[PDB]
């Protein structure tokens, strides 16, 4: 089996966008009048930091980001030189809806608009290298139902 | 030179399938991220690849429940990876 090269030290950047405070959304976006703050989200940022530092990544945390701020951070990394890296990771911790994540301001960012900043054309120094995005957000307001199965 | 697709080599790990919520315990973290980190920390030293790890996250998160609303959560990876992806601990 072919395996991606993964020998650099650090392996690459691991961005963490950690959205807690949604007061701006509650104030500005009528339908989001009751969107809640994401209490506990720092426990995920910390877990990802521990995990990915152990795996030799350079962690770059950013707390409480509006959509425009998220695009700015991504633009910085898209323009960066990743030639000496073997991988790039971006973790987003936020609210969301179908196909989107919310900024703290309640504006929407389609997921594809985030990942597409790192295509081989837009970020040539990551061409041929794995780009990993972890998105911890809702994708709508429905509860997924359960189905009964036999125990393994 | 050789050419591959512009959109090659991506892995997108979603905490949930479309249309649905994902869960956050204020006292522990989210079901998805906590499971992801536990599985990575355990299995990356064993040389397991990320798709195998993400399959385990699917299994683990699928066993959790919200007994207030009778809710479940189904994570979902999507990928254009062209090789095995491992994160060696060394």
């Amino acid at each position: 089996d072919k395996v991606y090269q993964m020998k650099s030290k650090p392996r690459g950047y691991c961005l963490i966008i950690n959205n807690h405070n949604f007061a701006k959304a509650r104030e500005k976006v009528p339908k989001l009048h009751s969107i809640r703050d994401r209490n506990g989200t720092h426990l995920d940022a910390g877990a990802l930091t521990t995990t990915f530092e152990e795996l030799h990544f350079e962690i770059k945390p950013h707390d409480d980001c509006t959509v425009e701020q998220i695009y700015e951070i991504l633009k910085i990394y898209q323009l960066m030189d990743h030639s000496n890296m073997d991988c790039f990771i971006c973790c987003i911790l936020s609210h969301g809806d179908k196909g989107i994540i919310y900024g703290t301001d309640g504006q929407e960012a389609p997921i594809y608009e985030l990942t597409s900043q790192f295509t081989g054309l837009k970020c040539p120094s990551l061409a041929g290298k794995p780009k990993v995005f972890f998105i911890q957000a809702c994708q709508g307001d429905n509860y997924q139902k359960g189905i009964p199965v036999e125990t393994d | 030179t050789r050419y591959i697709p512009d959109e090659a080599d991506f892995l997108l790990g979603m905490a949930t399938v479309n249309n649905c919520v994902s869960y956050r315990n204020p006292a522990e973290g989210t079901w998805y991220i906590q499971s992801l980190c536990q599985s990575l920390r355990e299995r990356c030293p064993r040389g397991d690849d990320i798709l195998t790890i993400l399959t385990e996250v699917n299994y683990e998160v699928s066993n959790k429940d919200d007994k207030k609303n009778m809710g479940k959560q189904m994570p979902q990876p999507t990928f254009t990876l062209r090789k095995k992806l491992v994160f060696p601990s060394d």
Binding site: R38, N39, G40, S94, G96, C138 | S22, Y23, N25, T30
Partner: peptide, 4 residues
């Protein structure tokens, strides 16, 4: 438990 809370939802995102």
């Amino acid at each position: 438990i809370e939802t995102x």
